[model samples]
Target: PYSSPPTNLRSLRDRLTQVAERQGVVFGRLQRHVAMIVVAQFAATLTDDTGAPLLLVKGGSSLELRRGIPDSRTSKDFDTVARRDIELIHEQLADAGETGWEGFTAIFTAPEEIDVPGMPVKPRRFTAKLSYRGRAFATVPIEVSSVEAGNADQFDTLTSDALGLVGVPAAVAVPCMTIPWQIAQKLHAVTAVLEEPKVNDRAHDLVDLQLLEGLLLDADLMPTRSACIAIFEARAQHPWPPRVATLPHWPLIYAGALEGLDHLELARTVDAAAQAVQRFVARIDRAT
Candidate 1:
């Protein structure tokens, strides 16, 4: 069940303001502002008449969810999973117009396309906006897929079987996919975007992989390379790592904009993430 929103939106704003200042990353002010709106609203709506409509809260946003959006990590939008109930979920969200402490309006738009390298067809998505005082800033980009499956036994206990990521509206949590599953999708996602480059593509897929890898190593969240491979296979993304020889050197691209990062801790984190990509490719070599 989704909990009530924070009692005081004004008070929450003060805290979130400092939070945004302290945890700044590589993005524009409007992006961060809207991202926060999207996250908070989405978190508040995890439960609807049909019960918890969330399957997987993923993409770069998941990186922020589990690890906090500090330093080099950031997300453009929220990506949730849906299938069989795609329209069902969308219908529920249509009236989700700021149904919480945070006030905003909903704007529905076209479905988004999530490209997968070499896949015959990609996952479909729909876009919606969270606007404040008639000013729109953030958009919720939800992706729908065929397999909205999960292992009921694998939720984190500390989070009350809820997704354990921090920085959402107070007392809000949802059933999230495991770190291993996230890693598998990220590996596939990175290759997909790199294959067919888009303008202003932030290379966020690599950033997410780097963060998920840390969690995998620290908590033993995923015990084996084969396990990660299996998750990818379950998603119909087999022979994991997708035969990509190397990852793009993203730091060089963001070099000039590092200062604008605003977070004092970002330079090292971004550099480290770039290096993680190297280790990731090598690990793939060893695993295969």
Candidate 2:
């Protein structure tokens, strides 16, 4: 016989707390975990009429999954690359909100199109207030965009050990961007911020870039370099080996990125991270 899901918010909160404690993560990190649980399960359940997945996880959330919860930075939102139009994706999500997934009901706000500076494609954004049996528990911000043409073969599956705490029996397979693709995107973001003052955010990309550097090996160099060039050309309309320079305001941006990440003992300081990023770009630049 199966046990019933948590009926009260307190019970759900306690369950999440236990998961956080067991996983050695702060409660704040648990919110992201919960979001991932919801997204992963939801993604697994729904696909396009053609049987293709509507969403492929990307950005910081995908990185966190790739690196594991304890080692990765805490991401505040779910960023995905959409397979269909944002309107269609939102329609399905909104329609499915009433039924929800695994005893968790989501109250979705209307989708909005937002401008991402230096990005040619505008992304759709929304928020989901997740509730367990009508009691609100956590809210997850989700953004979807179709900026780059993502390769289906370059995807991987992600699941959390914390899933069992939420009554999920088996690990759900949610498609995610591979490390090289993520690295390529991060490199593009860091270089874009350096080039365009308008795209002043994403200093956290530098931190992520530093951490991801260790995950790559000699065999990954060619794919990573190719991805970097492709992303730079497609997004920035520039050639490979973007102009490398540091801005005076970069220190402030880097400092802000480091805020709230006191849990992990980072290997590189701000100056060190910046230098490492430059070296990383140069290494990619030299890849033949």
Candidate 3:
């Protein structure tokens, strides 16, 4: 499992470093180290296994899923996993009866087959089912992911499929002819944190930043030709010509930080990531 760690923990440093290397980040775990700083200072939803607040240290993310990861047919939903699930995992309200989505379970009637190349495709059909979410919201697509990457389809192909399923397209407006290598890089960063086998609260705060840097820095990952054309159009829309950047600004960033508890490393990460941005900018300036 990519995110193999406990809630709010990050023990997968070596694995994440490997991912960064594969994605061409030469500084090794430092790239992740830098990200941990950013997220510890930001992200609003970071949490821990016991539902107690945690501070960012080894890893944390402002984007901790509120409902948690999307549960496809394959994933062992955290609640039922038993070993990892407990009463503390649920957010109990004023009334004890109003415990959060604990003890949740559902029987998913699988889909029928849509055969594609390379990978064997088999989709089971829907049938009567019982689920923790109850019947009203049972029959929805839990997750939309490729069975596997590299063999069955490419990233672009999967993006197109995800977009097609939701009936939407990228904000760019065109047919998305470009590959958006930035998205892939973001995925790499996120996976790195997730690979940790036992992420604790302190670590959660640290990792969230890595996720954000991965998401925002995708701009840097774009191929020169594609990124150049995209930048020209993006700047034309505003007088300040804010370079492709993290929008929704300060609140999103600060609120995200609040999600996790205080992290000692955030300030350092902010400074380091900034330096990274500057050095890369200089490199690109010279390239063109």
* Number of the top lDDT candidate: 2
lDDT of 3 at 110: 43
Task: Give lDDT per model, in order.
Answer: 0.50, 0.71, 0.26
Candidate 2 per-residue lDDT over residues 58-112, each given as its tens digit: 8778777777776677777888877655577777777676677767778788888
Tell me the number of clashing residue pairs for each predicted model: 1, 0, 40
Span of ten consecutive residues with least summed lDDT in model 2: 193-202
Query: Which TM-score value belongs to model 2?
Result: 0.86
What TM-score would every model get versus the actual structure? 0.62, 0.86, 0.24
lDDT value, candidate 2, whole model: 0.71
lDDT of 3 at 251: 34
Report the alpha-carbon TM-score of model 3 versus the true structure. 0.24
How do the residues 1-288 of candidate 1 rate in per-residue lDDT, one tens digit apiece?
Answer: 224432343433444455445555333443453444455455446564666444455554555556554433544556555423445555656656545324456766766567744444467677766554456545666565544334222433112111111133444454455665666556655544333445324455555566566667645333335555654566564455564333345555445334344544332444565566656755754653
Candidate 1 lDDT (Cα, whole model)? 0.50
Cα RMSD (Å) per model? 6.5, 3.0, 20.3
